[PDB]
Short mmCIF file of C-alpha atoms in Angstrom, two decimals:
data_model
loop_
_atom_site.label_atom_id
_atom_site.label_comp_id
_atom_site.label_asym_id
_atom_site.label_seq_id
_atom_site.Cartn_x
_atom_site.Cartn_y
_atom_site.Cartn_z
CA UNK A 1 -14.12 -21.02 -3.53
CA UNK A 2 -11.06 -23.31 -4.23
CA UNK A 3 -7.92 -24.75 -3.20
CA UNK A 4 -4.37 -23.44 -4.03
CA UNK A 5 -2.54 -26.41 -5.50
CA UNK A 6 0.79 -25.32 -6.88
CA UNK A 7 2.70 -22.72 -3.85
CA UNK A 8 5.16 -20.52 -2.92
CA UNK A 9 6.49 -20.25 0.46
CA UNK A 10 7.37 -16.72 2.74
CA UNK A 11 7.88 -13.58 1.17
CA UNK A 12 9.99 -11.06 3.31
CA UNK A 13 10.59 -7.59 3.46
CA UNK A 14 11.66 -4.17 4.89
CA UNK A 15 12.34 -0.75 4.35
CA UNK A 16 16.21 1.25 5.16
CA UNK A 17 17.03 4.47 4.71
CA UNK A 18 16.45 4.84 1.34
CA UNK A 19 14.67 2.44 -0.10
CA UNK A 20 12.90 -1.20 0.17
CA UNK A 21 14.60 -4.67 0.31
CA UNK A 22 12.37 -7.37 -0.46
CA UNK A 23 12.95 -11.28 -1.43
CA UNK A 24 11.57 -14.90 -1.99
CA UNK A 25 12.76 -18.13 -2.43
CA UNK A 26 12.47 -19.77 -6.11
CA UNK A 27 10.01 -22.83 -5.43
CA UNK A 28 6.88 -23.76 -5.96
CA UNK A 29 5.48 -26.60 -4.31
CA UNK A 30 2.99 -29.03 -4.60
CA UNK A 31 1.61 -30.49 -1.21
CA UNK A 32 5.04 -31.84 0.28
CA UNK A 33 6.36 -32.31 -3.19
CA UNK A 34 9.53 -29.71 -3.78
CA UNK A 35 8.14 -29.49 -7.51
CA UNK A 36 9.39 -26.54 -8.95
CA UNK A 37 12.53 -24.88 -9.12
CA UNK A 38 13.01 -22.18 -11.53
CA UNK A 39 9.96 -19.82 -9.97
CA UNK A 40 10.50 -16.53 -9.42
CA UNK A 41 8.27 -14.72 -7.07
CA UNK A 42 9.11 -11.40 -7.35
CA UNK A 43 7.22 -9.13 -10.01
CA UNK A 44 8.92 -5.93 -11.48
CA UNK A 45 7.17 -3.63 -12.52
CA UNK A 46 8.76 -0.32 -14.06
CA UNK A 47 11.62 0.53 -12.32
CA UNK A 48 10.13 1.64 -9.31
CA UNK A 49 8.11 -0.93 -7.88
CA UNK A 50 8.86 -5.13 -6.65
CA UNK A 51 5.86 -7.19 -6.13
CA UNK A 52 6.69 -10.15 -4.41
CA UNK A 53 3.55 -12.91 -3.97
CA UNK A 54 3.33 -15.98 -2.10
CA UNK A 55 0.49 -19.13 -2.02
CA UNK A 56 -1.49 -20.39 -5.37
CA UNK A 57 1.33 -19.88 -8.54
CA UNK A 58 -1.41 -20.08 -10.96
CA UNK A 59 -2.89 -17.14 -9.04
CA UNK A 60 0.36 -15.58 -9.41
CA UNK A 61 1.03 -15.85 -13.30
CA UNK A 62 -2.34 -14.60 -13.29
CA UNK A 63 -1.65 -11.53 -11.31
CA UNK A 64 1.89 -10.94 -13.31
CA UNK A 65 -0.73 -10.91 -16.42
CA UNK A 66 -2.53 -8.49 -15.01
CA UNK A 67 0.56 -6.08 -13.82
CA UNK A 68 2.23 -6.13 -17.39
CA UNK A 69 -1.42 -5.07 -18.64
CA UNK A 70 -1.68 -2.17 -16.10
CA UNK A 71 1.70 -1.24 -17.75
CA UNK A 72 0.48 -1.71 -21.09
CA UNK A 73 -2.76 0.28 -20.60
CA UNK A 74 -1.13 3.21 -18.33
CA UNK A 75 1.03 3.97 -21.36
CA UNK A 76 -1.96 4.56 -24.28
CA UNK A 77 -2.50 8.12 -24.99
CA UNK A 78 0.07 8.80 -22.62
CA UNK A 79 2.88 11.51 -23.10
CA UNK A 80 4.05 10.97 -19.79
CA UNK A 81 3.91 7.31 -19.39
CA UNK A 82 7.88 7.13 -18.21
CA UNK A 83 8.23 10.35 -16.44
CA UNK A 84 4.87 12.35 -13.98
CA UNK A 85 2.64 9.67 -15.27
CA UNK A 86 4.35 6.42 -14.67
CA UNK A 87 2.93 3.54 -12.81
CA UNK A 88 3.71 4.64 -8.60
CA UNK A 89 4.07 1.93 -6.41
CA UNK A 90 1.19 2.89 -4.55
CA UNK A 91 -1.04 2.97 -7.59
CA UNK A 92 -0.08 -0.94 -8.14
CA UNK A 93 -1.10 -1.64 -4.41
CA UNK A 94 -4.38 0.14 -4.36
CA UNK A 95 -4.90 -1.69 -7.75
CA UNK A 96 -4.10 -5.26 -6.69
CA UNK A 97 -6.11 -4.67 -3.17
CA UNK A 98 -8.63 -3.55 -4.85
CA UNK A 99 -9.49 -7.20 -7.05
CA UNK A 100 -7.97 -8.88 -3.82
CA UNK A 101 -11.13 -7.78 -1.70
CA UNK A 102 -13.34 -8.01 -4.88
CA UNK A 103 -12.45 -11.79 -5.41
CA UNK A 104 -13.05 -12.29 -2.14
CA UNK A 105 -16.32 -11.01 -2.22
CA UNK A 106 -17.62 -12.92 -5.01
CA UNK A 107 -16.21 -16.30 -2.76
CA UNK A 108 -13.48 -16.65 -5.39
CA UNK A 109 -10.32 -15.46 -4.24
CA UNK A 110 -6.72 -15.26 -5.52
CA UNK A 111 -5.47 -17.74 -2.84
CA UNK A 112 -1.98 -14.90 -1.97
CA UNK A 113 -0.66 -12.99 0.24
CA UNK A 114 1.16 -9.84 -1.94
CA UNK A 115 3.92 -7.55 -0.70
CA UNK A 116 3.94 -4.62 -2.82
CA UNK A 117 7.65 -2.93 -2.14
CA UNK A 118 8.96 0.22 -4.23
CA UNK A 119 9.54 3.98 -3.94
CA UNK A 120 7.18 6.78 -4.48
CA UNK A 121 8.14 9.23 -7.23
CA UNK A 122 8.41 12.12 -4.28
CA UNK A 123 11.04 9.24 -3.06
CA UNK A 124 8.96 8.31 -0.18
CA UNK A 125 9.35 4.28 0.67
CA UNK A 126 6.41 2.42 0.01
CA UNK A 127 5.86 -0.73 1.56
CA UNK A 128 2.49 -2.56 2.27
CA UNK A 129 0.74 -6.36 2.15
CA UNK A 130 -2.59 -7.27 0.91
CA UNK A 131 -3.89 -11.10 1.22
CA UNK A 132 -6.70 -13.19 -0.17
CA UNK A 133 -9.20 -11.86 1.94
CA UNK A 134 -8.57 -8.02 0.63
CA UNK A 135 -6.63 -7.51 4.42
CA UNK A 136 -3.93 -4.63 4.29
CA UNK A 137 -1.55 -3.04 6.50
CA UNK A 138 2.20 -1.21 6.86
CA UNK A 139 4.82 -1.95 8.85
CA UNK A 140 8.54 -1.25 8.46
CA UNK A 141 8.63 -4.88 8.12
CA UNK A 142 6.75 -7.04 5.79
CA UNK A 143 6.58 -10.82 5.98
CA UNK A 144 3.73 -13.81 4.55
CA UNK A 145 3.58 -16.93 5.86
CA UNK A 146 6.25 -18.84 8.30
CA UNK A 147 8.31 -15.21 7.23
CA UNK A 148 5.79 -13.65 9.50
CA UNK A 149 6.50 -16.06 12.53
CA UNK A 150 10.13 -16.24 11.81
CA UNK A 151 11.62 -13.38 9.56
CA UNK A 152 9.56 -10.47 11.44
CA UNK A 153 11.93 -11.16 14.90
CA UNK A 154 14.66 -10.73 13.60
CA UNK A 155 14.29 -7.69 10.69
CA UNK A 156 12.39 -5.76 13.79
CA UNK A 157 15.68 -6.33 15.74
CA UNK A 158 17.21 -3.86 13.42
CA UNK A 159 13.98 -1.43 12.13
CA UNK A 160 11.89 -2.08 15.63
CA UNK A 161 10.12 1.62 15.19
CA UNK A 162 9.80 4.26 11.96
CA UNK A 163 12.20 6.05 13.55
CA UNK A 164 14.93 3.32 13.12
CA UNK A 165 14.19 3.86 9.44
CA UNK A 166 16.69 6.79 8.42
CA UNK A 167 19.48 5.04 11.02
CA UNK A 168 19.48 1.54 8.57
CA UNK A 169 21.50 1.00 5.84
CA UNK A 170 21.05 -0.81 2.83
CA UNK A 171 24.25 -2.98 3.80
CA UNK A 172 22.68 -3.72 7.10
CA UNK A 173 18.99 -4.21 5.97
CA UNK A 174 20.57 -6.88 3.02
CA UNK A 175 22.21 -8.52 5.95
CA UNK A 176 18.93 -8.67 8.11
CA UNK A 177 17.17 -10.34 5.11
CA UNK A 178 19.66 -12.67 3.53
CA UNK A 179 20.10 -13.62 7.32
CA UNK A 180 16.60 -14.34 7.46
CA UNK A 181 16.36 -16.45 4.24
CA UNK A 182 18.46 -18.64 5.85
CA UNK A 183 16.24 -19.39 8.95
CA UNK A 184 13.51 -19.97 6.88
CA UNK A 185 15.50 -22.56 5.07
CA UNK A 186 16.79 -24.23 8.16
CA UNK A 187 13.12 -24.52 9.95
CA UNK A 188 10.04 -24.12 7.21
CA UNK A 189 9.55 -27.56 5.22
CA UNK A 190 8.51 -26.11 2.16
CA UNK A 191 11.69 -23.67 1.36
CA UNK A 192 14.25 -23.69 -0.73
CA UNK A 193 17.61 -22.70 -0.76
CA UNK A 194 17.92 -20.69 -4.10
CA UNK A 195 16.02 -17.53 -4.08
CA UNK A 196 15.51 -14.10 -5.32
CA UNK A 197 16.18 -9.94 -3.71
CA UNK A 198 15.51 -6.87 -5.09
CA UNK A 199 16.32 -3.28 -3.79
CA UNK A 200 14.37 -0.24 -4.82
CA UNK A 201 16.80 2.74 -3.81
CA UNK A 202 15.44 6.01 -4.44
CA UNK A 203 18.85 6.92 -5.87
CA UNK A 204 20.06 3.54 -7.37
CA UNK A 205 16.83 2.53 -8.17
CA UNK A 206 15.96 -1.26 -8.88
CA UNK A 207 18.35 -3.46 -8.04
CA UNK A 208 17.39 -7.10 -9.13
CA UNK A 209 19.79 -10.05 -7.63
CA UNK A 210 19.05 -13.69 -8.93
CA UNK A 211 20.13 -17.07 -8.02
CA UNK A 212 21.25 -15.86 -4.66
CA UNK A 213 21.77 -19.05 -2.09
CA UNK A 214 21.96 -20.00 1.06
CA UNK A 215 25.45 -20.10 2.27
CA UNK A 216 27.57 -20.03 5.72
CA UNK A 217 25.52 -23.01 7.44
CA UNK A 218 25.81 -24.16 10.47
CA UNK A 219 25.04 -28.30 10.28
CA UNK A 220 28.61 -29.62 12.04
CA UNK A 221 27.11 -29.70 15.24
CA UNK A 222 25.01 -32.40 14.29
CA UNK A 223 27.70 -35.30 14.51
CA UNK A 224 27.99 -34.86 18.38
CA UNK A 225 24.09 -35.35 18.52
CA UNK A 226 23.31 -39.24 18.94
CA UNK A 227 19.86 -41.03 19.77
CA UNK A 228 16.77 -39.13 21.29
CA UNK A 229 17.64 -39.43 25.06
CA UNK A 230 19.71 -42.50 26.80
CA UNK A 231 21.89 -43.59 23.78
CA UNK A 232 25.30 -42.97 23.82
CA UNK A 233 26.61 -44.28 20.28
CA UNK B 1 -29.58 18.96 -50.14
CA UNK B 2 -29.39 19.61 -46.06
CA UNK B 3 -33.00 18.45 -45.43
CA UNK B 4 -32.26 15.15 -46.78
CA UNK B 5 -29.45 14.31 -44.84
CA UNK B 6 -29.91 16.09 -41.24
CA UNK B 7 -32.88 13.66 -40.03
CA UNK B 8 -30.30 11.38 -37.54
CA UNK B 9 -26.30 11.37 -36.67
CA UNK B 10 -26.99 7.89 -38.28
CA UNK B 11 -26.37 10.07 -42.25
CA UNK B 12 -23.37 11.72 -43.81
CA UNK B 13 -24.01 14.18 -46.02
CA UNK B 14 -22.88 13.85 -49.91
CA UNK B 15 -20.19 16.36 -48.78
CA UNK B 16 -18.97 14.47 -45.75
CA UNK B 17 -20.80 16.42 -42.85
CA UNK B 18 -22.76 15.50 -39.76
CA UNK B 19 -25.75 17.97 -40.04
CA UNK B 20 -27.09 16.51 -36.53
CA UNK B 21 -23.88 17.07 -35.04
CA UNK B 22 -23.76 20.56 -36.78
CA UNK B 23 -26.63 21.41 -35.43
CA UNK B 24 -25.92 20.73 -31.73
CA UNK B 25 -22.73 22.72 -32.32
CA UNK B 26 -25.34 25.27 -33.10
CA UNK B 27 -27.00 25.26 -29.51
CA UNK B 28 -23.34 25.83 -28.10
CA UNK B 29 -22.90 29.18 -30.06
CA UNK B 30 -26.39 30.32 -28.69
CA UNK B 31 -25.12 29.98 -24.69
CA UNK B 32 -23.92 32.23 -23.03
CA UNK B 33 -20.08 33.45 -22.69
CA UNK B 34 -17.18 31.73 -20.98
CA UNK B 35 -13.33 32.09 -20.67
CA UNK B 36 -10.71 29.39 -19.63
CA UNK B 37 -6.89 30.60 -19.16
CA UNK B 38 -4.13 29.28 -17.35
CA UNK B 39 -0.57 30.17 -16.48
CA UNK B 40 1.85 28.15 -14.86
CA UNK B 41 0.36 27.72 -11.44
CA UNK B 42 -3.09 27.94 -12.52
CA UNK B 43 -6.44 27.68 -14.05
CA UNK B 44 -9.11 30.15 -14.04
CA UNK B 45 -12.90 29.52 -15.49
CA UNK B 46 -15.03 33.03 -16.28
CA UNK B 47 -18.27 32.48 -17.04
CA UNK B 48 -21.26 35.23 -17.82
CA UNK B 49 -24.25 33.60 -15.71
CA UNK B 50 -27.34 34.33 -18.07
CA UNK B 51 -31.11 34.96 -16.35
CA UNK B 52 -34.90 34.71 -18.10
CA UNK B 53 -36.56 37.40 -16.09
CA UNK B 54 -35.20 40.45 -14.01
CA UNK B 55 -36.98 38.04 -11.25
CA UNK B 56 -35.15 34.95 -12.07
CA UNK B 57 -31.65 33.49 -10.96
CA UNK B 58 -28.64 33.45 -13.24
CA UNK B 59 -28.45 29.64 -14.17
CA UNK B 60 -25.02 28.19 -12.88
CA UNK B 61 -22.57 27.89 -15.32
CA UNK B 62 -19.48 25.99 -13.50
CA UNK B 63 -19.64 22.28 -11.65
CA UNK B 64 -16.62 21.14 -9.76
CA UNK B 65 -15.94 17.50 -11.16
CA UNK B 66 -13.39 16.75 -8.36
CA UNK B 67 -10.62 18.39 -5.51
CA UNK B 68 -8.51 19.33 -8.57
CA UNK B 69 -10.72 19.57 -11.60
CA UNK B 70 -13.99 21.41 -12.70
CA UNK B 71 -15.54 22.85 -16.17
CA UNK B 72 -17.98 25.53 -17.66
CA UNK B 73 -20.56 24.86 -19.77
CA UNK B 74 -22.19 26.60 -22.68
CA UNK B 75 -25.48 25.62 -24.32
CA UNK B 76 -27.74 22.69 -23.29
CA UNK B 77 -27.63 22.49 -19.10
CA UNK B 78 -28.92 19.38 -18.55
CA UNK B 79 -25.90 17.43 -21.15
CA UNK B 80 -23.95 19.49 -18.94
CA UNK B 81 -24.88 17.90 -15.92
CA UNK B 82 -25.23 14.19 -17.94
CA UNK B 83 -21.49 14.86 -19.07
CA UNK B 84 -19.84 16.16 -15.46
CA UNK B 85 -21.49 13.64 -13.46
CA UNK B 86 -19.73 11.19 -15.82
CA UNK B 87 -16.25 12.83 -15.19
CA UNK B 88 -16.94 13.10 -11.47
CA UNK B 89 -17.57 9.18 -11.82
CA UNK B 90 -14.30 8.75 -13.95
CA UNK B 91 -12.26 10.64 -11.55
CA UNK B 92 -13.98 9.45 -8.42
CA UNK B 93 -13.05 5.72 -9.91
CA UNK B 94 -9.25 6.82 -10.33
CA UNK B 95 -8.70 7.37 -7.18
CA UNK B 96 -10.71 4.71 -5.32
CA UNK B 97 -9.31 2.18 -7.82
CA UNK B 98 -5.48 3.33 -8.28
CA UNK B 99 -5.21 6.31 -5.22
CA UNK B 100 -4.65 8.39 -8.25
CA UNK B 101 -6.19 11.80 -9.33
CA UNK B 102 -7.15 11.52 -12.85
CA UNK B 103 -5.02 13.40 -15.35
CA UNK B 104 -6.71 16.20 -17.07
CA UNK B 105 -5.74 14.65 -20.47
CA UNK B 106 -7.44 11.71 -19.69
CA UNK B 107 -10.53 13.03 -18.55
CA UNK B 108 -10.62 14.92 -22.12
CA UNK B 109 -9.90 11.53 -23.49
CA UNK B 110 -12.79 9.96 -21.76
CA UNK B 111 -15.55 12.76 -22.51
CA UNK B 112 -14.31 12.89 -26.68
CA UNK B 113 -15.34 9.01 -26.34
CA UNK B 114 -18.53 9.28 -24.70
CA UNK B 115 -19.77 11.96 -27.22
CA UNK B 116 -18.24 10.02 -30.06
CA UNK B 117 -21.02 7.54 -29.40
CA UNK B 118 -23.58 10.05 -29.90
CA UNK B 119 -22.88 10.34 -33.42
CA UNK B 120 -22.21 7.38 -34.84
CA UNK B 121 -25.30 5.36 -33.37
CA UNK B 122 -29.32 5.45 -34.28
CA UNK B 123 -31.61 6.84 -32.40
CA UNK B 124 -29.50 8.86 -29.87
CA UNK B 125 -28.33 12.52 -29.80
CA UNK B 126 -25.71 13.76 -30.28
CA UNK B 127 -24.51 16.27 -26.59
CA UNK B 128 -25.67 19.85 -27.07
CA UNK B 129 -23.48 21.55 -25.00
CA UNK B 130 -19.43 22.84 -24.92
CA UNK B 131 -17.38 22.49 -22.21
CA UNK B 132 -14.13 24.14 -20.92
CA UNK B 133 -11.93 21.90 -18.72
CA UNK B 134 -9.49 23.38 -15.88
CA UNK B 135 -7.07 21.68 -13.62
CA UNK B 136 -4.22 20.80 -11.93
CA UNK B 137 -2.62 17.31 -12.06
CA UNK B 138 0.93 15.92 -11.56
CA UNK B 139 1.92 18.06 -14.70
CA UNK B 140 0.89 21.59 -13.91
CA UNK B 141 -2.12 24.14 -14.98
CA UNK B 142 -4.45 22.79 -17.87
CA UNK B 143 -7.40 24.13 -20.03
CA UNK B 144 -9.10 22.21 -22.30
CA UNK B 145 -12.12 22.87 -24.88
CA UNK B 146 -14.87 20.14 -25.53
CA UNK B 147 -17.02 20.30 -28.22
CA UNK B 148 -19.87 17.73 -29.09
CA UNK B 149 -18.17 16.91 -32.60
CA UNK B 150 -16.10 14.59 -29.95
CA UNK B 151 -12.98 16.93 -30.47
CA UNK B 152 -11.14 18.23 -27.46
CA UNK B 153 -8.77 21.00 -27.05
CA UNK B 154 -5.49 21.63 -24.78
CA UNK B 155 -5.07 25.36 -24.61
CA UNK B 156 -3.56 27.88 -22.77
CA UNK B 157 -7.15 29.68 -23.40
CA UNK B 158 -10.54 30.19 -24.98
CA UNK B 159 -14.11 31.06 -24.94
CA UNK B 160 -17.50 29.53 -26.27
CA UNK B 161 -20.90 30.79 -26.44
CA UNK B 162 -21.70 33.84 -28.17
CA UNK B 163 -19.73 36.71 -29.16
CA UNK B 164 -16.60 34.78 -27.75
CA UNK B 165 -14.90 35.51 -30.33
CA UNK B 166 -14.00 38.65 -28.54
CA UNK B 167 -12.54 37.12 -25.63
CA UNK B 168 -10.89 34.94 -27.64
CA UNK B 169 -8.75 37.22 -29.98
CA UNK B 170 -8.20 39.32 -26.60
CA UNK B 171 -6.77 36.14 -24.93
CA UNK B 172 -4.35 35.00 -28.32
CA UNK B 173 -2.64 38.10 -28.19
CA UNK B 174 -2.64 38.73 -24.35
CA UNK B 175 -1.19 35.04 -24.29
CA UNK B 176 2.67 35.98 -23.67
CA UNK B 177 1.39 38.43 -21.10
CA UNK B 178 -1.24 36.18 -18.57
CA UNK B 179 1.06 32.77 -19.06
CA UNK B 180 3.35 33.55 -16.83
CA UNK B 181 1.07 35.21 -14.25
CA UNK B 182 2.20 32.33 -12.00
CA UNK B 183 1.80 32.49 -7.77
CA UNK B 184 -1.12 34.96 -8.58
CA UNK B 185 -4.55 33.88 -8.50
CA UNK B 186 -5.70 37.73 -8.39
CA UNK B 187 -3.95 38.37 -11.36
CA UNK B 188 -4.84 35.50 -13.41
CA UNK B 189 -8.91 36.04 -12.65
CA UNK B 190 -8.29 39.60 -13.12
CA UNK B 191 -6.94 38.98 -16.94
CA UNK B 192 -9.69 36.15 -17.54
CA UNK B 193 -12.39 38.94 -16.90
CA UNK B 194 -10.69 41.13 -18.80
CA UNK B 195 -11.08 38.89 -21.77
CA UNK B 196 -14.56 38.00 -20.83
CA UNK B 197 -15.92 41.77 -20.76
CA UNK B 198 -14.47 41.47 -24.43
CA UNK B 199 -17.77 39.87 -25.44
CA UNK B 200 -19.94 41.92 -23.75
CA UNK B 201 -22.33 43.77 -25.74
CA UNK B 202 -25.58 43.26 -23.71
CA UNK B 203 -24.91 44.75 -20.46
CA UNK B 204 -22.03 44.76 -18.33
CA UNK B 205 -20.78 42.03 -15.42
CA UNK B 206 -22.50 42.60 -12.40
CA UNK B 207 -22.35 40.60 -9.17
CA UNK B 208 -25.10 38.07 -9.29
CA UNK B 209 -23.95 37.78 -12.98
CA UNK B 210 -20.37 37.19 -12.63
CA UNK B 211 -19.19 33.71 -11.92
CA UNK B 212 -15.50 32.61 -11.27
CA UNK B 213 -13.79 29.45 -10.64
CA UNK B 214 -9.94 28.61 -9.93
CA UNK B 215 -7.47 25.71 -9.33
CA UNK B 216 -3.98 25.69 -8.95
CA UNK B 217 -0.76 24.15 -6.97
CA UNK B 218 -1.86 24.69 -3.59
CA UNK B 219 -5.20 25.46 -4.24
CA UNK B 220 -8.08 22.92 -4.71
CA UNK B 221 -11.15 23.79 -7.07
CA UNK B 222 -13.42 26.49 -5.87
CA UNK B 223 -16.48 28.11 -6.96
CA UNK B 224 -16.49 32.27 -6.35
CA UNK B 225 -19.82 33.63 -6.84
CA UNK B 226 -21.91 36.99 -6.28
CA UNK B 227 -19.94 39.21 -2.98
CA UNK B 228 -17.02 36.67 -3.38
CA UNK B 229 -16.65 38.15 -6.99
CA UNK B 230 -17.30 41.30 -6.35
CA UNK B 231 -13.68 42.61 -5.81
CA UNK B 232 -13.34 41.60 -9.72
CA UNK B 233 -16.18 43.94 -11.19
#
């Protein structure tokens, strides 16, 4: 049993037509210190597959150790390594839920909440969540933390049902999400404005944007608010 | 010479050989016959099912190790069973761990290294038994051939036990022929008791004698055995 010291905030997601957008802000807090500002949440793996992780960082590094090793190992005595025998996104998930529900077990978790996001070599999208206590589950949206509260509204506005799935575009589904990274920037306390995306596209494949930002802010109608009631100055 | 240097696995000979290991190769040759082949589409496993008495059973000669893979055995039953129970472990841990049916290369992989340890080690055995690998993984149709020595084989067919040597000349110059015997099971079984009956000697295949195993694209390891083979005799 611990406590996570060093964090990272939401991590939000969702799935188009065809592919998987998923993205997280580049901070890592302490308490309600802003800390850290060069943390990136989102971890690559092949070209196929975006694991995004929120809560304890040191958890984190230790889980991106543990994903470049599944890489590493996957390709001995391997022929096939990059081609029928590459890492599939689902393999990663099952993999990661797997010592996610162990750890918890033994009382000794990884204090996260994963988002594994990619596309299945049959080019199937593949989106699902495990958390500290080894809990997993799909939806065509995927958010941790405040994401969940605030993100999840508004990306089920435009994928409410699978069936809205094959109508979304990846222009519309980048919208939804950079839309939403803005919300949480405006209301969660522990955000920041610079962040990370990444798009798995079953035909462009793995589309990595960094240092992405916050823009188009709406702050102007501040001046016209004044006092908490009766003042008028 | 020999006498002195056979006593353990723990000795090499002045000439460089493993008598011990030799030796177990030796119980293999004394088993009874069995033929591996595959084409495209898939893997067949002929084995002659040998009996004590006119009043006993013909012992089984094929265990399925999981939905897509299974083997044949020749000499020592029980390493047999030691040696698939292990693979059924190995491929039962693929897919609870990673959702991912082990490769058949692997699983050859994983049986040369837990025979290797056999021979290298005091006061164990080495396995006295050979094994013949089918199945069907994300890259097609595969055969392979263990031997205790450790060394495994990818073929496109063989036989071990006695007199396979028949079956085995029959299959390396049927080869071009029964490879491409794809979207035919019939076909495929049909060839791989054709090179079977080409180490008879003995008697003949009968039905409580004749044992027959296939896997394939669409079609998940089964055992055929006695009436079930009879439209093969």
């Amino acid at each position: 049993t611990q406590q996570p010291i060093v964090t990272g905030t939401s991590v939000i997601s969702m799935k188009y037509d065809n592919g998987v957008i998923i993205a997280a802000d580049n901070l890592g807090s302490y308490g309600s210190l802003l800390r850290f500002n060069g943390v990136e949440r989102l971890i690559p793996v092949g070209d196929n597959t975006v694991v995004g992780i929120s809560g304890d960082i040191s958890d984190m590094q230790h889980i991106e150790r543990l994903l470049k090793d599944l890489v590493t190992e996957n390709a001995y005595d391997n022929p096939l390594a990059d081609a029928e025998e590459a890492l599939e996104p689902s393999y990663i998930f099952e993999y990661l839920a797997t010592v996610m529900y162990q750890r918890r077990s033994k009382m000794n978790p990884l204090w996260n909440a994963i988002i594994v996001a990619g596309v299945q070599s049959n080019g199937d999208q593949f989106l699902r969540y495990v958390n500290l206590l080894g809990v997993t589950y799909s939806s065509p949206t995927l958010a941790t933390g405040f994401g969940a509260h605030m993100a999840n509204p508004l990306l089920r506005k435009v994928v409410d049902r699978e069936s809205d799935i094959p109508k979304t575009t990846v222009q519309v589904a980048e919208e939804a999400i950079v839309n939403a990274m803005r919300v949480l920037y405006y209301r969660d306390a522990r955000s920041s404005r610079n962040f990370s995306l990444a798009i798995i596209d079953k035909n462009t494949g793995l589309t990595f944007k960094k240092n992405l930002q916050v823009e188009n802010m709406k702050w102007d109608f501040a001046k016209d608010i004044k006092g908490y009631g009766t003042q008028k100055i | 010479f020999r006498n002195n240097y056979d006593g353990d696995t723990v000795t090499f000979s002045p000439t460089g050989r493993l008598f011990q290991v030799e030796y177990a190769l030796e119980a293999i040759k004394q088993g009874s016959v069995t033929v591996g082949l595959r084409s495209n589409t898939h893997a067949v496993l002929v084995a002659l099912k040998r009996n004590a008495d006119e009043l006993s059973s013909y012992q089984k000669k094929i265990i399925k190790c999981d939905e897509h893979m299974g083997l044949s055995l020749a000499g020592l039953a029980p390493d047999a069973r030691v040696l698939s129970n292990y693979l059924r472990q190995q491929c039962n841990y693929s897919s609870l761990v990673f959702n991912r049916k082990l490769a058949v290369e692997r699983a050859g992989h994983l049986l040369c290294d837990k025979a290797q340890k056999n021979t290298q080690s005091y006061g164990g055995r080495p396995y006295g038994v050979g094994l013949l690998i089918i199945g069907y993984d994300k890259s097609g149709a595969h055969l392979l051939e263990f031997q205790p020595s450790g060394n495994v084989t990818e073929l496109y067919g063989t036989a071990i036990g006695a007199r396979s040597q028949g079956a085995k000349t029959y299959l390396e110059r049927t080869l071009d022929t029964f490879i491409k015997i794809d979207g035919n099971p019939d076909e495929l079984i049909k060839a791989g008791v054709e090179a079977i009956s080409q180490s008879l000697r003995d008697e003949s295949l009968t039905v409580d004698n004749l044992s027959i195993a296939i896997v394939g694209k669409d079609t998940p390891f089964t055992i055929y055995d006695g009436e079930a083979v009879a439209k093969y005799i």
